[PDB]
Amino acid sequence: SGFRKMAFPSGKVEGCMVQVTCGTTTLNGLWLDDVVYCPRHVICTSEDMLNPNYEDLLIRKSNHNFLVQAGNVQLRVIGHSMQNCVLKLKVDTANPKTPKYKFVRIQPGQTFSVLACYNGSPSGVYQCAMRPNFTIKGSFLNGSCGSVGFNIDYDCVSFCYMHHMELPTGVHAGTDLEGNFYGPFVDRQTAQAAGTDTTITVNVLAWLYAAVINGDRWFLNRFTTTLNDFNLVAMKYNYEPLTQDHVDILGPLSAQTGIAVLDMCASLKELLQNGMNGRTILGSALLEDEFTPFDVVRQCS
Amino acid sequence: SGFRKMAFPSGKVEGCMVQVTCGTTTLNGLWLDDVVYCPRHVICTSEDMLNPNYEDLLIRKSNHNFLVQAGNVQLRVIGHSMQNCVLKLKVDTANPKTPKYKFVRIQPGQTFSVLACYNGSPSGVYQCAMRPNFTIKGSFLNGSCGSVGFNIDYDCVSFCYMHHMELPTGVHAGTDLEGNFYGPFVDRQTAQAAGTDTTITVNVLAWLYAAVINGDRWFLNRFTTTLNDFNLVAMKYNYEPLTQDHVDILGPLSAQTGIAVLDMCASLKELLQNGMNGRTILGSALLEDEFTPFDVVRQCS
Ligand SMILES: [Br-]
């Protein structure tokens, strides 16, 4: 029993984190085989921030301008190249701790673990969701550039996020490991801001199923609704539309609990229209949308 | 910016987890130097559960009755002994991944990271607090016996918790690594139940400071209160008493924010008496008490 925001064990990723310094800028890199991946922002000066031309900035660099340190061991950079918003630093040494891995771009609504890192040293690990507006509500301080997000399936680490920057509302933006930004954000100084966000409906339903599996049943009711009628209420409360594919994905949880998805939707409609009346669900007084159906199955019986 | 339930990186502990089997019971053990620590419940049969005499059960065992597996490598047990509610299995091989470590018993109100494990394989990592009633609100399924809680300071892992059992309310009880239970719980079948719990006041104040550091200020007010008067309100709402030592511990956060502790106490009093009026603090609609002052300083600027 119990239900927590649970991250994947971080060991496999910890052994890949390195420190990358260029000029007076230090940030984190990811060392896999004989390549170190890091944010291309590492080649910028605080002066260049307005509208840097990274192709120019990079042509003016040499391998010896990049100091890469894996713990107490310096790695010799033997090649460099830019891929979108990341840098690929070829080093003379393959990481002996390289796990089986993949680079996988996630969807809004998906979750992942974040290994927050400073000066190449991991500091903490926590779970995040990619918001509908392609930001993440992370916890990052100065120096966290290059920290990575990932999931683990069996033995294989699927890297999905590399951290770049913090937006004015305190939320975070970054790239996939191919260097392509999540959302309409750029690695130069602008007034860019998080767009309007919505609540991830399928996840809220998954979390209600988790609550039922864990003995919180007070919000259940005898009613059922139609997908159409529920989506009318969802729109009104700034919730994402629920699709038949979502309903199908919730199948296993519906079967485990004996509660049809559209029955659970009737409970969510009530909760949206009346609130909780001072009660809580899984220790929360709000509807929690950062657990996927997979996360629930992973943690619940 | 940002504030999350953040666990310590789990790698150092992952390399210590092993599988221990005796009879048909399998659970997790902790392999440090040439000793494997695990719950003594591993020597029980479902028949013995009512009132086992563990000294008798252990005399009837031999080293060869304990199958210990570190991944794909079997460890040969060369000695066994009981220490309170844990077993110490001496093995022929010292763990080459043993980190610098300590066994440290924590106080109610303190937090720690949990590496939930099944069949010796780590599954997830999350943060927990030791409740005033000496339970923890964990997330554990069958097979999680022997999972460990820990903190990390610099390079040294301070192990503070080994998981044993789940109480009827779905909360969890276990021991320190010397095998001494936290709280009035025993490793035999009884009607034992979590005692009445309280809210960890110093932690709630720490979290309010985190909120201010992160730009949530709506709950602040011009008022200040006395320690005595605040503790009168605390008692009424089932909050722990606030001590001068707590006030001193909150010193650094008070100084960083410019908000005196007794001023923040006036805000908490208001929140207790009126609620939040539909607003949230750090993404929560409840007063969160599982962040210590240290946790806040660790994560905030
Ligand atoms: Br909440």
Residues ending a continuous segment of chain A before a break (C–N > 2.5 Å): none
Q: Which two tokens stand for residue A147?
A: 């920290």
Q: Which residue has the tokens 């409740």?
A: B131
Chain A neighbors of B283, CB-CB under 8 A: 137, 286
Judge whether A263 is closer than 8 Å to chain B, CB to CB.
no
Q: Which two tokens stand for residue B213?
A: 């550091």
For ligand 1, the distance from its centroid to the CA atom of residue A286, given in whole angstroms, is: 5
Q: What is the 3-state secondary structure (H, E, C) of chain A?
A: CCCCCCECCCHHHHCCEEEEEECCEEEEEEEECCEEEEEHHHHCCCCCCCCCCHHHHHHCCCHHHCEEEECCEEECEEEEEEECCEEEEEECCCCCCCCCEEECCCCCCCEEEEEEEECCEEEEEEEEECCCCCCECCCCCCCCCCCEEEEEECCEEEEEEEEEEECCCCCEEEECCCCCECCCCCCCCCCCCCCCCCECHHHHHHHHHHHHHCCCCCCCCCCCCCHHHHHHHHHHCCECCCCHHHHHHCHHHHHHHCCCHHHHHHHHHHHHHHCCCCCCECCECCCCCCCCHHHHHHHCC
> Which amino acid, one-letter code, is at A147?
S
Q: Which residue has the tokens 């998906």?
A: A110
Kindly state the DSSP code that residue B22 receives in the 8-state scheme: E
Q: Which two tokens stand for residue A121?
A: 């040293």
Q: Which residue has the tokens 């511990």?
A: B249
Tell me if A9 and B301 make a contact (CB, 8 A cut-off).
Answer: no
Judge whether A296 is closer than 8 Å to chain B, CB to CB.
no
Q: Does domain A1-14+100-197 have CATH number 3.40.50.300?
A: no
Return left, alpha or beta for B143; rule: phi > 0 is left, psi -120 to 50 is alpha, else beta. left
> Which amino acid, one-letter code, is at B173?
A
Closest partner residue to B9 (CB to CB) among A115, A171, A285 is A115
**Helix, strand or coil, per DSSP, at residue B296:** helix
Alpha helices in B1-133 (DSSP H): 11-14, 54-59
Closest partner residue to B285 (CB to CB) among A214, A285, A301 is A285
Domain locations along chain A = 1-14+100-197, 15-99, 198-301
For ligand 1, the distance from its centroid to the CA atom of residue B285, given in whole angstroms, is: 4
Tell me if B125 and A15 make a contact (CB, 8 A cut-off).
Answer: no
The candidate with the shortest Cα–Cα distance to B276, out of A276, A3, A203, is A276
Q: Which residue has the tokens 């949530």?
A: B216
Cβ atoms of A97 and A79 closer than 8 Å: no
**Same fold across B1-14+100-197 and B15-99:** yes
Q: Which two tokens stand for residue B95?
A: 């763990």
Cβ atoms of A206 and A250 closer than 8 Å: yes
How far is the alpha carbon of A200 from chain B, nearest alpha carbon, in Å? 15
Cβ atoms of B68 and B83 closer than 8 Å: no
Neighbours of A75 (CB within 10 A): 22
Judge whether B212 is closer than 8 Å to chain A, CB to CB.
no
Tell me if A11 and B8 make a contact (CB, 8 A cut-off).
Answer: no
d(CA B178, CA B201): 29
d(CA A81, CA A84): 10
* ∠ CA A49-A54-A60, rounded to 5°: 110
Neighbours of A233 (CB within 10 A): 17
Chain B neighbors of A172, CB-CB under 8 A: 2
Cβ atoms of A300 and B123 closer than 8 Å: no
Kindly state the DSSP code that residue B162 receives in the 8-state scheme: E
Cβ atoms of A106 and A169 closer than 8 Å: no
Dihedral pair phi/psi, residue B63, rounded to 5°? -50, -45
d(CA B234, CA A124): 32
d(CA A292, CA A295): 5
> What chain A residue is nearest to B12 in terms of C-alpha separation?
A11
d(CA B35, CA B87): 10
Crossing angle of helices A227-236/A261-274, nearest 10°? 30
For ligand 1, the distance from its centroid to the CA atom of residue A290, given in whole angstroms, is: 13
Closest partner residue to A1 (CB to CB) among B6, B14, B170 is B170
**Helix, strand or coil, per DSSP, at residue B69:** strand
Rg (CA), chain B: 22
How far is the alpha carbon of A20 from chain B, nearest alpha carbon, in Å? 20
Domain A15-99, CATH class in plain words: mainly beta
Q: What is the DSSP string of B228-258?
A: HHHHHHHHHTTBPPP-HHHHHHTHHHHHHHT
* ∠ CA A165-A168-A173, rounded to 5°: 30
Q: Which fold has domain B198-301?
A: main proteinase (3clpro) structure, domain 3 (1.10.1840)
Neighbours of B46 (CB within 10 A): 9
Bridge-based pairing of strands A73-75 and A67-70 is antiparallel
Cβ atoms of B293 and B250 closer than 8 Å: yes
Tell me if A125 and B4 make a contact (CB, 8 A cut-off).
Answer: no
Write out the catalytic residue numbers of A.
Answer: 41, 145
Question: What number of helices (H) and strands (E) belong to chain B?
Answer: 8, 13
How far is the alpha carbon of A11 from chain B, nearest alpha carbon, in Å? 4
Chain B neighbors of A283, CB-CB under 8 A: 137, 286
Tell me if B139 and A166 make a contact (CB, 8 A cut-off).
Answer: no
**Helix, strand or coil, per DSSP, at residue B56:** helix
Tell me if B125 and A7 make a contact (CB, 8 A cut-off).
Answer: yes
> What chain B residue is nearest to A298 in terms of C-alpha separation?
B123
Beta strands of B100-204 (E only): which ranges?
A: 101-103, 111-118, 121-129, 148-153, 156-166, 172-175
For ligand 1, the distance from its centroid to the CA atom of residue B204, given in whole angstroms, is: 13
Cβ atoms of A17 and A97 closer than 8 Å: no
A104 to each of A23, A116, A156, A184, B120, how far by Cα in Å? Answer: 31, 19, 12, 19, 28
Tell me if B11 and A10 make a contact (CB, 8 A cut-off).
Answer: yes
Tell me if B9 and A301 make a contact (CB, 8 A cut-off).
Answer: no
d(CA B42, CA B26): 7
Judge whether B141 is closer than 8 Å to chain A, CB to CB.
yes
d(CA B85, CA B174): 9
Chain B neighbors of A115, CB-CB under 8 A: 9
Q: Which two tokens stand for residue A184?
A: 């309409």
For ligand 1, the distance from its centroid to the CA atom of residue B287, given in whole angstroms, is: 8
Write out the catalytic residue numbers of B.
Answer: 41, 145
Judge whether A71 is closer than 8 Å to chain B, CB to CB.
no
